[PDB]
Structures are given as structure tokens and as C-alpha cells.
């Protein structure tokens, strides 16, 4: 996209220099070893480490000197940008399927009790913890339920409004 | 009943049926009867090859020490592969592998089905006697009349000498690895000063 790597971008280096300069300008009003001086020094160290880490990660910077993420799985894989969107996509989808499968399993387990509505606002905490730990293996069980036809309710068993 | 540890319990599957049955199975390795049969055959095979190996290692060792042999007996048994023969090392292994393949396939065919390999393949009149054990053949393997006169006793002597030979061959292998000496040298060093030249002290000096 016409971008340049942040490790060689002049705007990136200028932004790091300006942020460090502003923090150092704030730093000179306090005595050495005081709590504000230590806090500002820790902020300066974090700023330097962050700019170094963003430069070392292969991030691409625009004309504004700011990192730009690449989200097409093709351009990310062939140019080393998969850690920006693609691997976070896989991680989020795994965790989201975990949460959804744990909720579905808890709802289905509570459906079989004598008071199904009771477990929805007074949580069965041991059962919820057991079901929550079992959500790690959600893709296998979910894909099997999809192949078996047990994941979906039949259309004849679901209420609809008159058309 | 004789046993390896008098006054101790004997496993229920060892009732003296096997030759050399002293009830020694602390790990309960042979529990199913088929595994026990395979282990009996393996004990016989390993013991007989260990008896041959012990004889072949002891014969060279005194020949090299006394000089009654040649330059071949002067080399140690673990350095006998560096000696030059008429054939290279690659071909001798192949011909012995082929001969062993024939012999051991015949033996294994007897092991799977007893009495299956009892006839000469090229001479229909030369056949081994019937009632042959899988580990105890007959006929040309016993050219002398030795299987009358307490067959049960001679099996016990065979398995005893086999176990002693297996221990002796393992001692050869281990003493060559640690000390790096021929068996007679180790025996002479033990007979030199046994209270300092044994497994203790030497291995403490090795460290």
C-alpha cells in the first residue's frame, strides 16, 4: 500500500523523539529519586521499549509515522504481518467459540432440570466451572454435532409468526 | 520345593512344570501362558548362544595369554573385528544372515506348529522323531543316546549352565566397557589384590 517499515520511517522516529522530549520536559521539575521522577522515568522506559518493539515487529508505517495493520490473509502471510490480524483472528474465534459452547452446554444441562429457569439466575457454580473447563475442546464437539445434525433444531419444532 | 528364596511366596503359574522352575519372577513378566512359552524358548536360545559365546571368549583368552594360538588369538574379543580375514566384513555378515535365516525360519516354523519341520526337505526317508518339543529337537541334533537317563535332570543342568553363561557373557560385556580389559586380565587383577581391585574402588577411581 505504499507504506514503509516503521524501523526506517522518519515519522516514527520523530514521534518517539517528540514523546520522549515531552516526558523529559515534564521530568526536569522534580528532584532525582522522588516518586514523580521515578514514575516519569518508568514512562520514558516504557515509551522507548514500545517504539523499539513496534519497529522490531515489522509493522508498516504511513506518512503520518503511525503503524498500519494488514488484514488480508494473503498479504499478511507472504510479508510477515500475520501477527497483526490473522493470529488474533484465530485466537478470538477460539475463545469466542469456547464462551458460546460453554453457555450452550450450561443452557442444555439446565433444560433437563425440574426448575430450568432457576439455574439461569442462581448459577450452578460447580457445574458452570466443570462445563467452562470442558469448553477447550469445543471445535471437535461442535463439528461433530454439525455433522450429526444434532446442533440444529428442526424447523417444525420452532415457533413462527403467521406469514 | 526348591526355590530362589526359601520361605517366600511362589507365583501360582510356576508349579515346577518348566525345567529349572525355582519360582523366580518378582516382576511377574511371564503371566499369560503364550508369553511364558515364548520366554521359555527365548531363555533356551539366549542361554545356548551364551554358552557358545562363553566358550569362545574363554578359549581365545587363554590362547592369547599362553601363546598357544596365533596372532588372531592375541587380539581381544572386542577387537577381533579389526583383524583381517580372507573376506571383508560386509560379506561374512550377509552369508551368516542367510544361513541363520534358513535355520531360524525352520526353528520358528517348529515353534508355531510342533512337528511341522521334522523331515529333510530333499530326503523323504530322513525324518526327526515324533513327539518333539519346540525347544528340544531330536534325531541329528542328538547323535548320541543322551536323552535316556534322566531327561529331566539334563534339562536342569542345561538351564543352570545357560543362566551361568548368560551372566558370564554379561560380565564380559560390562567389564570390557568399564575396565577396557580382557576377562583373564580382570580375573588376574582381582586375584592380585581383591580387596581393592573389584567393582568398588575401581569404579570409585574411574570417577
Amino acid at each position: 500500500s505504499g507504506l514503509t517499515p516503521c524501523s526506517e520511517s522518519k515519522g516514527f522516529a520523530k514521534r518517539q523523539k517528540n514523546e520522549i522530549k515531552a516526558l523529559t520536559k515534564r521530568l526536569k521539575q522534580y528532584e532525582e529519586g522522588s516518586a514523580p521522577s521515578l514514575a516519569l522515568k518508568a514512562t520514558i522506559e516504557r515509551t522507548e521499549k514500545r517504539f523499539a518493539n513496534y519497529g522490531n515487529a515489522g509493522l508498516l508505517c504511513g506518512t503520518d509515522g503511525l503503524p498500519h495493520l494488514i488484514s488480508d490473509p494473503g498479504l499478511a502471510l507472504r510479508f510477515g504481518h500475520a501477527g497483526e490480524t490473522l493470529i488474533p483472528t484465530v485466537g478470538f474465534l477460539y475463545i469466542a467459540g469456547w464462551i458460546g459452547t460453554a453457555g450452550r452446554d450450561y443452557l442444555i444441562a439446565s433444560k433437563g432440570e425440574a426448575k430450568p429457569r432457576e439455574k439461569e439466575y442462581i448459577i450452578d457454580v460447580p457445574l458452570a466451572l466443570k462445563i467452562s473447563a470442558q469448553g477447550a475442546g469445543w471445535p471437535f464437539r461442535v463439528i461433530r454435532e454439525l455433522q450429526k445434525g444434532t446442533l440444529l433444531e428442526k424447523d417444525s419444532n420452532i415457533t413462527v409468526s403467521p406469514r | 520345593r526348591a526355590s530362589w528364596l526359601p520361605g517366600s511366596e511362589i507365583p501360582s503359574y510356576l508349579k515346577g512344570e518348566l525345567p529349572g522352575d525355582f519360582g523366580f519372577d518378582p516382576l511377574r513378566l511371564g503371566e499369560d501362558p503364550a508369553a511364558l512359552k515364548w520366554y521359555q524358548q527365548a531363555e533356551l536360545q539366549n542361554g545356548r548362544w551364551a554358552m557358545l559365546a562363553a566358550a569362545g571368549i574363554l578359549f581365545v583368552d587363554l590362547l592369547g595369554h599362553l601363546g598357544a594360538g596365533g596372532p588372531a588369538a592375541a587380539t581381544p574379543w572386542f577387537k577381533a573385528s579389526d583383524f583381517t580375514y580372507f573376506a571383508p566384513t560386509s560379506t561374512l555378515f550377509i552369508v551368516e544372515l542367510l544361513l541363520f535365516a534358513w535355520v531360524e525360519v525352520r526353528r520358528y516354523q517348529d515353534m508355531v506348529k510342533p512337528g511341522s519341520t521334522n523331515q529333510d526337505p530333499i530326503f523323504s526317508q530322513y525324518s526327526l522323531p515324533s513327539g518333539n518339543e519346540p525347544g528340544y529337537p531330536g534325531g541329528i541334533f542328538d547323535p548320541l543316546g543322551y536323552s535316556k537317563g534322566n531327561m529331566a535332570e539334563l534339562k536342569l543342568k542345561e538351564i543352570k549352565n545357560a543362566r551361568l553363561a548368560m551372566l558370564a557373557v554379561l560380565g564380559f560385556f560390562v567389564q570390557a566397557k568399564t575396565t577396557g580389559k580382557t576377562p583373564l586380565d580382570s580375573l588376574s587383577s582381582h586375584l592380585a589384590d581383591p580387596w581393592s581391585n573389584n567393582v568398588f574402588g575401581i569404579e570409585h577411581a574411574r570417577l
Binding site: 473447563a133 470442558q134 477447550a136 475442546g137 471437535f140 464437539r141 461433530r144 | 499369560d32 508369553a35 515364548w38
Partner: protein, 222 residues
């Protein structure tokens, strides 16, 4: 059942009669019977692949440590083989894709319909090679040329294959992680651990315990 992975726990009932079963399924992945059959086949295939791979890594490495042969180490063996390979990289990949497509489709079709690859017309006259044993993951035929599946110790060999398979899978993942963390070979890692087991382990390779996640590593040190 071979035993219990957690003594005192309630083992699942669907893992009672499987070979190599210790009742280990805390995630309940094999609760569905079709899933259990598919995962039995998958564990066997993974086990045999790891078995052969760990053999082809460890036996050359042990022979090199004893000084018998001088072969390239496993993480670089692809480089030295490809330079002396008459067949270049792309056609090797294409040939592997074709051959594995064929053989894995045959294995998959036998999994879906047992014994179907041994019927008349399944192959071009050679379907007797793959008649099947009627068991999931145990094909036989050419794959058992010595015919020791008909022997009495068939059930013990199934248990031996599965346990050695799990050991081999853990061993290969150990090889990969040990290279990625230490940068050396597996026998080198073993000898470093045997020389000083307190100081040479995963806690000192600088990778397995990250410094940011474990600030006490840099504090509680001499």
C-alpha cells in the same frame, strides 16, 4: 482397561474396551461413538508417524553419539538431502501430494466402509492386498506380511503399539521444543542434563519461562 490415568476418578464408560485405554477423556471428545472411532484411527496414524519419525531421528543420533555413522541432524537434514537430491523441491512436494492423496483417500474410504477396498473391482486386480481385518485402524494384508496379527499376542501388541506411540508423539514434540528453546540436538540436550541436572533443564533455557511473566527469576538469583 489398561488402568486409570487418575486413580479414584470415575472413568467414562465408552472407553472401557478400547486398547490402550486408561479412561483419559476429561474434555469428553470421544463421547460420541463416531467421534471415538475417528479419533482411534487418528491416534493410531499419529502414533505410527511419530514412531517412525522418532526412530529416524534417535537411531541415527545414537549411532552418531557412539561414533558409528556421521549423518546430518534432524533439523538440518532437509537442507543436505535437497542439495544431493536428483528430484528438486517442487516436484517432490507434488509427488508427495499425489501419493498421499491416493493412499489417504483409500484409507478414508476403508474407514467409512470397512472392507470396501478389498472387494472385487476396488483395485485393478490387487484388492486382495487390502481385504482388511474388520477392525478400525488395523488394516492387515500387505501391511501385515509376517501375519503376526493371527498370533496369540495380538492384543498385547495393540497395547504395545499404542503406548509406544504416545511416547513417540511426546518425544517428537520434545525434540521440536528442545531445538526451538536450546538450539542443539536431542542427545546434546540429554548429555547436558546428565552433566548437571539441577542447572541444565527447561527452567534455564531462557525460553520456556519468559522473564516478563516470571519477575522472580531475575530477583531470586545469586
Amino acid at each position: 482397561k489398561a488402568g486409570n490415568w487418575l486413580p479414584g476418578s470415575k472413568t467414562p464408560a465408552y472407553l472401557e474396551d478400547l486398547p490402550g485405554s486408561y479412561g483419559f477423556d476429561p474434555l469428553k471428545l470421544g463421547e460420541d461413538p463416531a467421534s471415538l472411532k475417528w479419533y482411534v484411527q487418528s491416534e493410531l496414524v499419529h502414533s505410527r508417524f511419530a514412531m517412525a519419525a522418532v526412530a529416524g531421528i534417535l537411531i541415527p543420533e545414537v549411532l552418531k553419539a557412539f561414533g558409528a555413522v556421521n549423518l546430518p541432524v534432524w533439523y538440518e537434514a532437509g537442507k543436505y538431502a535437497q542439495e544431493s537430491s536428483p528430484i528438486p523441491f517442487n516436484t517432490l512436494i507434488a509427488l508427495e501430494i499425489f501419493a498421499f492423496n491416493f493412499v489417504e483417500i483409500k484409507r478414508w474410504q476403508d474407514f467409512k466402509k470397512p472392507g470396501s477396498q478389498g472387494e472385487e473391482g476396488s483395485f485393478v486386480g490387487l484388492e486382495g492386498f487390502f481385504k482388511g481385518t474388520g477392525e478400525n485402524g488395523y488394516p492387515g494384508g500387505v501391511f501385515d506380511p509376517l501375519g503376526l496379527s493371527k498370533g496369540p499376542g495380538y492384543e498385547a501388541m495393540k497395547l504395545r503399539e499404542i503406548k509406544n506411540g504416545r511416547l513417540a508423539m511426546l518425544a517428537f514434540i520434545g525434540f521440536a521444543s528442545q531445538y526451538l528453546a536450546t538450539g542443539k540436538g536431542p542427545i546434546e540436550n540429554l548429555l547436558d542434563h546428565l552433566s548437571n541436572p539441577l542447572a541444565n533443564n527447561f527452567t534455564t533455557n531462557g525460553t520456556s519461562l519468559p522473564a516478563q511473566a516470571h519477575p522472580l527469576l531475575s530477583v531470586l538469583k545469586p
